Design a protein around this ligand. Structure first.
Ligand code: AGS
Ligand code: AGS
Ligand code: ADP
Ligand code: MG
Ligand code: MG
Lengths: 578, 41, 471, 470, 193, 193
């Protein structure tokens, strides 16, 4: 092994000397405590090491040992219910080993080495196996966790363990030439896990929010970004997605965020239920927690560990949702490391390779045919926290250029307590066209036309607001003022969604379809009544407006009857009231 | 309109001043990179 | 351990920094003693060490130092503070030395002042509602036990008065939470960084009048004190707070008097080190540095005690987008923002609720905690006040006489809200008083326009008039 | 083959190799490591002491002990052939469609030589894009640089694909009848996602437009140096085809904003101090060296036409990228977000659009005698319709004069039928017929920009092309 | 040093209605009067020097016109001290460093003025300290910092500018002097944004 | 060098009534013209080249577009000189640079053109110098300044931009040449904000 000594210490940065032969981005043990660090520069006989832990108390002369391997994660059974740090250390074990505080230098296996798993082989001796093929199955929480061949392992099966209880260290399958395959393998977090081919985004990723699932949909394999100032509701939207998504597995990455939010997830989620499995929601969730007061160099590691775990679960045929709770924190960590490196910044202090790193991270998403032949997907939703809410900041601009959906939050709606507080004008989605056949087959044949009509009404309202802010709403004609009123009705009782209300927190596609149909039926009838001389102030007093407003609070089970009753009420009210 | 124009030009001047300061800092750090590389060899 | 080692051969003194060579056995982050030719000893910390030389930031001013007679000696490898329950009635400077004239504290433990990050698994969910007696806080931006709730202030705004009032009136309501037990009062840790004599005298006199000094630890860094001590001051204060809360079951309220001065000192140190700055010249690690201070508050599983932080910062030009308030808002659970327009109107406390926020409000309010209508009343108040503000902007164009009667009602609600719900003076309002005032205000609006409130709460509480509450 | 051992420094994208005085500046090298993997790199600085090499891919796994550097070519060169048509490349000329590498007729330096100004000639013939708002009002002329100014969510890729698979020349309108004049499309994609890559491949293959196209597709996670080299490769192929085989070449460059960001990042990596607005101070010259390679040459029958596509970062035309592009190119076609969100495709807004070379490529003997006047009348009438649409919201429908209501109807029908083309391929005659049908809604004699002869010859037809008889 | 800092409970009477009524400053207080050129900062300072109830007035011309210092030197001997009735100049100490005097001396002049004011405070007097412009002192600090090659913080000023200003303004206050008497220093510092 | 600069007391006659009457330019004066797209700037420039009383016309294309430069290079050799019937190019010098030509050439274009104009002035001729875009030249100057890592002044332009423009424009004037003969250079420089 490559061994050296510490030459300089400055914050998270340690320069070692005598490290000739050490490779770039290899993991090193720094100091007598063996703190984990990564080599980010080689210069003569020296190596620049960014330590993933606190460096306070280190002295010049302490040994630095290179392990000769880059950062890697253990991929196997045992991750589906746990919370990890940036470099994949279980926080439950760390708590049991240290207490209420996280102390540096703790060494603990990512996967519990004593937990027993019910192994069921799927292969027989003489079978030839390629990377990503299913060796067998193990149940975890009702999930059928598939033991995969490592992506770059090839050979013929020589011996296979029979069905029984084994630990992840047990070599369940031994190939010819003596290569042993355990229940887990290690993968470098910076390498994208190989696949066969990327597939077109056919099916949607149902987030459970009306505005996101209707006006700005994201596909099952797509990417989305949700930037906004502090208090706009990024994390509440992320947690709503984690609670209500239709993804099989949710990987939540709290990169440089509040620890109280990780605690909220840890406490609330075991009580909630998985909509599809029926079991606890925490059983389908993997948490990678790197709080803001944890070491800065570990934020990049946190992002990469999360995305690698998401890729691994995709390789088993699952639909994975990856919520990165902030990428601006990762960018700030990169800027801090670059400042320690004394490198010339690109723009606003960030290193030039920030855009390349972001693009590499976001390109890992997609619906794919896995190496084993089965079909899985990864959906990445990345939150961005621009400094001061300045959307012209380089991270937000770099994210604009690689994401298919953009959910822009504005502090104006958050101040009003109008939530989800999505800026409709500043948001967009590039998946609306490709998802239309699925909408026609699964929601309604006329759903795309209804959605387009709603968007056109919002556009007309936006155009008329230019005049409303000029001469007041009373200076408009009855048709234009009707458009304004229908726009505010849409905004208040279709786009609003209370993430804490027991009914309004979730909304199926058919409920949103019914609400849109009700609103547009009311709009058509109101315009017809306007053309026959009825006043708009007379229209605004109809109790069917109250029914439309209360529609969103109606439960999913009883919604169809409410919708039929309200459509009948719309027709009757605008027949009687002319 | 004149007030909005004055605000626009004020914001433009402030942004340009911040950019000028950033360029000055970049020049300083490039000079220090070159110097600290030159004497150390 | 107890034998002395001295490093002569200082090679560079400029501003707050000091270079000493051949000091390869000084640990990173170690505290050192700088002795000059007159015998005076200054404090310092190692911020970069290599086999060539070590970089030391000097806490005090560098007047009188010289490369021929100055000596640097190691004190301890890790910056630690001696803590005990004995210091509950004591005053200290920015570096933890007593300034009250009493003898030094006999420490039970010596804890690293930087602390350690709390394990998220070991944290609890902050849930115990704290009644501050201020309606715009209790009703709309509820403060819970274990929260970081900074006050975003300005140069002339009375943030110190609001902090003193909160410290005077803050109490839990176990009867509403169903616990129904007598509760010990808050212990207060008061960290002042760059505080002026006026504000210091005000705080001292308020704590004397309320009798809270006997249970308050004070770390005072004056405006004429050296500015590099402001880096240590909040870390020492929070070390004391964490020790008390999580080892003696104290409920600690921590007030950081001005984080703008702390960020000023941080910027000075970073610029002396030529750190790659963020916006407005502040160092790029400012977010992490502020996080290492703020994230030390909270509640821990299996522990009785708690740490609640109320930092105070003055946005320079009332600019919410300034780096200091921006990063603070990105770290903390919401903020209380003061309004200069409300202050000029003579409204106290000048808290405008729209830019304010409490992220943990949902945890502490609702049925079995405060009352069933709390959340919906808060939402309706926010919506109605936003409508009133928009109608004010419209009136600024079309004039009041051109309004409809509903917009007129919203305008009247807005100004009545400002003059009655916000403007309360120094009185201590129970949560029930604030809720009935809020319902009296909401009764000004048509019943059918309370769209965010369920019909049950409307039937139960709508109708009362403000003149029925007070003559 | 000489192997340059002696790596003395690795950090970020750069590595220093000593005793490399024989490496020419700008050369491309192969970086080999202990695992036998080979990476690409470019020499960005060479001196007596060491040579600085910028690595294409990530520098992970490299070490100062086992890393070796060897030269592959002293000048960035691309092997071009006529068998490049129907092929796809990864932005540095390597096939990615699974077909065997082409046999190079000749190898050309991608840093092309500037055209001699006296060798150029005036653009005089147009390209039929099949889109009415371009063909009639913002005509594309063979040899023009006509960028498309897009937005964040606008369908610029769809319009690019549609133009690519619809664009054709019309020698019959000039009276030549010479279908022997070949046409090719060079499509360069920069910083695109896998979604966009799949879309472009599917669009080019489903219609058979691939057989006359060369695709240089650079993905978003590909090396940024490949992004910088992609337009150079595309323009080298375009120049070769046009000025050595008399092809009429249309070059589509999506997206130039990605190229500018890659240029910014590479400049920052080479420790260059940025210029105005944080972009390199030489971005104008680089964009000029890209754009000015289009044109028509005296004595040669080929042509190069460029349609750069760039997303304005915040829909701001004052941003450096669109600003310099406007300085260099001849006009712009601006997509409209309000048209897009009303359901109109392609969302081209005629009012801010402009083709500066249009008046040279339209008229008698080129398109038709009435083209210019019809375009002018359409522009004026649409502007009137739009401002009357704004006014009617406050003053009401009946308060307007009868001709004002006619302008309202004209603007509505214009947006409905002329702009909202869909995926139709409209010949210039079809577009002119639709324009005349729309102008027939206005009273005769209100068409002031049009001579009485053209009015008598064409006025009177009614809207049947799109509705009632598609 | 002082024995104790007292709370300021008596007004600093400037003789100007708006300041003494709407925006009063106490005897040991501090006031800033920023404004553009020609707004009347120096006129307000000289009105305070002529008419205020301070026992001793210390006027610091930090980097401003010499004609203003000459105007003071000529007019003050003829005016009457509002407290004792003697000539006004016997109440006054002038520290002048004009704009075309050496730039580094502005910083020294500020400290000389505040130290002299503190010395007169120690004798039991109430002292008004007028700083003609602290912006010139800040500019001198910026120039010296640029000569030191220090990294500027904001608009070229050194990062410790706020520290210097705070340490200067903190010297004011109503105190019990080391001798047991009661004295105060009032600082009014003009700013030239 | 010249023997003496003369007074702007004789007119440069453009042959256009509006310019010759309402907004005249003296022989040896300087004029600026904005260039809106459709405003017919090229026709005005051709009219100045064709009908003005200047003996020699020097036309400088600084950083023009490829097709816009091609327009000039194709259409000047077609203009006939009214004073001789022959081609107008027989008394015209053309400097042509496109945007893709080296930045140093684009920066030196106006200096080369005005030096040639001064040389023809030294022969007693009256020379009309036309700079087709000084904004393009300023862009080239800004790029060169950025390559030298100089401070950007306003909008990235070098602080000496005004000095360079003044040094270019002051070369115009009616003079007594070193040969004792009267000559003049009149500069009409187009700007494109
Ligand atoms: N209170 C006042 N009464 C009468 N005239 C006044 C008053 N204040 C200002 N002026 C007039 O306005 C002029 C400006 O004087 P100052 O206020 O001293 O200027 P300034 O504030 O010092 O700004 P400068 O010119 O940059 S030093 C004076 O010379 C008077 O003519
Ligand atoms: N004085 C004029 N008399 C007659 N026609 C003119 C006149 N000025 C311009 N034109 C017309 O304008 C066209 C030629 O000039 P333009 O193309 O407008 O010049 P230009 O486009 O402004 O040049 P630029 O801005 O450098 S591209 C022809 O249609 C001319 O008939
Ligand atoms: N969809 C929502 N429904 C209800 N309340 C919301 C919603 N989004 C945000 N909020 C409220 O706004 C606060 C701020 O949201 P949060 O996500 O914590 O800020 P950020 O944008 O930084 O993540 C939340 O604590 C919650 O009280
Ligand atoms: Mg968040
Ligand atoms: Mg003055």
């Amino acid at each position: 092994m490559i061994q050296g000594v510490i030459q300089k210490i400055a914050g998270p940065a340690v320069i070692a000397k005598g490290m000739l032969g050490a490779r770039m981005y290899d993991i090193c043990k720094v100091g007598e405590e063996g703190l984990v660090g990564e080599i980010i520069r080689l210069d003569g006989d020296t190596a620049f090491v960014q330590v993933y832990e606190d460096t306070s108390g280190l002295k010049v002369g302490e040994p630095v040992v290179s392990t000769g391997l880059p950062l890697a994660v253990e991929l196997g059974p045992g991750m589906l219910n746990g919370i990890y740090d940036g470099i994949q250390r279980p926080l439950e074990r760390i708590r049991e080993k240290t207490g209420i505080y996280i102390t540096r230098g703790v060494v603990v296996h990512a996967l519990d080495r004593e937990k027993k798993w019910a192994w069921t082989p799927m292969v027989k001796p003489g079978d030839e196996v390629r990377g990503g093929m299913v060796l067998g199955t193990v149940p975890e929480f009702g999930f059928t966790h598939k033991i995969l061949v490592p992506p770059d392992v090839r050979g013929r099966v020589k011996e296979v363990k029979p069905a029984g209880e084994y630990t992840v260290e047990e070599p369940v399958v031994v190939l010819e030439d003596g290569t042993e395959l355990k229940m887990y393998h290690t993968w470098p977090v910076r390498r994208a896990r190989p696949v066969q081919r990327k597939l077109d985004p056919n099916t949607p990723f149902l987030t459970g929010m009306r505005i996101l699932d209707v006006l700005f949909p994201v596909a099952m394999g797509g990417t989305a970004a949700i930037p906004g100032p502090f208090g706009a509701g990024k994390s509440v939207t992320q947690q709503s997605l984690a609670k209500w998504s239709n993804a099989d597995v949710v990987v939540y990455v709290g990169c440089g965020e509040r620890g109280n939010e990780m605690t909220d997830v840890l406490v609330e989620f075991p009580e909630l239920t998985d909509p599809k499995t029926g079991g606890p929601l925490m059983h389908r969730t993997v948490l990678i927690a790197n709080t803001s007061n944890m070491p800065v160099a570990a934020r990049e590691a946190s992002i990469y560990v999360g995305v690698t775990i998401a890729e691994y679960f995709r390789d088993q045929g699952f639909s994975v949702a990856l919520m990165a709770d902030s990428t601006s924190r990762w960018a700030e960590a990169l800027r801090e490391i670059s400042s320690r490196l004394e490198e010339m910044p690109a723009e606003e202090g960030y290193p030039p390779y920030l855009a390349a790193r972001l693009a590499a991270f976001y390109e890992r998403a997609g619906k794919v045919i896995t190496l084993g032949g089965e079909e899985g997907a990864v959906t990445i939703v990345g939150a961005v926290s621009p400094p001061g809410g300045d959307m012209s900041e380089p991270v937000t601009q770099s994210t604009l250029r690689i994401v298919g959906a953009f959910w822009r939050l504005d502090a104006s709606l958050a101040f009003r307590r109008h939530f989800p507080a999505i800026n409709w004008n500043g948001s967009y989605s590039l998946f609306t066209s490709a998802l239309d056949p699925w909408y026609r087959e699964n929601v309604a044949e006329d759903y795309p036309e209804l959605r387009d009509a709603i968007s056109e009404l919002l556009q007309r309202e936006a155009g008329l607001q230019e005049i409303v802010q000029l001469v007041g709403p009373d200076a408009l004609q009855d048709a234009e003022r009707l458009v304004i009123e229908v726009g505010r009705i849409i905004r208040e009782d279709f786009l609003q969604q209370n993430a804490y209300h027991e009914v309004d927190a979730y909304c199926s596609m058919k409920k949103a379809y019914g609400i849109m149909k009700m609103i547009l039926a009311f709009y058509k009838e109101a315009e017809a009544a306007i053309k026959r001389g009825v006043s708009i102030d007379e229209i605004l007093q109809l109790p069917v407006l109250e029914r439309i407003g209360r529609a969103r609070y109606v439960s999913e089970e009883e919604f169809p009857a409410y919708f039929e009753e309200a459509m009948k009420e719309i027709q009757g009210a605008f027949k009687a009231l002319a | 309109i004149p007030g909005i124009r004055a605000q626009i030009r004020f914001i433009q001047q402030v942004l340009e001043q911040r950019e000028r300061e950033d360029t000055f800092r970049l020049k300083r750090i490039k000079g220090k990179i070159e110097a600290r590389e030159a004497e150390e060899e | 351990d107890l034998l002395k080692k001295e490093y002569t051969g200082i090679t560079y003194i400029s501003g707050p920094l000091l270079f000493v060579e051949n000091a390869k056995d000084l640990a990173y982050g170690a505290i050192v003693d700088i002795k000059d030719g007159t015998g005076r000893v200054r404090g310092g910390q190692v911020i970069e060490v290599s086999e060539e030389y070590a970089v030391i930031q000097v806490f005090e001013e560098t007047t009188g130092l010289d490369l021929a007679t100055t000596s640097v000696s190691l004190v301890e490898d890790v910056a630690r503070l001696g803590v005990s329950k004995e210091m509950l009635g004591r005053r200290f400077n920015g570096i933890g030395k007593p300034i009250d004239g009493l003898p030094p504290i006999t420490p039970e433990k010596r804890l690293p002042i930087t602390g350690l990050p709390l394990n998220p698994v070991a944290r609890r969910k902050p849930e115990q509602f704290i009644q501050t007696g201020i309606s715009t806080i209790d009703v709309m931006n509820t403060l819970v036990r274990g929260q970081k709730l900074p006050i975003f202030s300005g140069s002339g705004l009375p943030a110190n008065e609001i902090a003193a009032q909160i410290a005077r009136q803050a109490t839990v309501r176990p009867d509403l939470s169903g616990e129904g037990e007598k509760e010990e009062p808050f212990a207060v840790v008061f960290a002042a960084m760059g505080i002026t004599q006026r504000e210091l005298s005000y705080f001292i006199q308020e704590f004397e009048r309320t009798g809270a000094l006997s249970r308050s630890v004070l770390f005072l860094n004056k405006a004429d004190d050296p500015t590099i001590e402001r880096i240590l001051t909040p870390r020492m204060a929070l070390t004391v707070a964490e020790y008390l809360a999580f080892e003696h079951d104290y409920h600690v309220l921590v007030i950081l008097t001005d984080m703008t001065n702390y960020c000023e000192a941080l910027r000075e140190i970073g610029a002396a080190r030529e750190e790659i700055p963020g916006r407005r010249g502040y160092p790029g690690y400012m977010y992490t540095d502020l996080a290492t201070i703020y994230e030390r508050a909270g509640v821990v599983e299996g522990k009785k005690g708690s740490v609640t932080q109320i930092p105070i910062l003055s946005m320079p030009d009332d600019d919410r987008t300034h780096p200091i308030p921006d990063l603070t808002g990105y770290i903390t659970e919401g903020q209380i923002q003061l309004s200069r327009e409300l202050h000029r109107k003579g409204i106290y406390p000048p808290i405008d609720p729209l830019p304010s926020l409490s992220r943990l409000m949902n945890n502490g309010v609702g049925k079995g905690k405060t009352r069933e209508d709390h959340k919906q009343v808060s939402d309706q108040l926010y919506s109605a006040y936003a409508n009133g503000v928009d109608i004010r902007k419209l009136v600024a164009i079309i004039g009041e006489d051109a309004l409809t009667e509903n917009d007129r009602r919203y305008l009247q609600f807005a100004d009545a809200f400002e003059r009655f719900f916000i403007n309360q003076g120094q009185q201590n309002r129970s949560i029930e008083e604030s809720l009935q005032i809020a319902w009296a205000l909401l009764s000004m609006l048509p019943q059918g326009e309370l769209k965010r409130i369920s019909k049950d709460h409307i039937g139960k509480y709508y109708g009362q008039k403000l003149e029925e509450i007070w003559g």
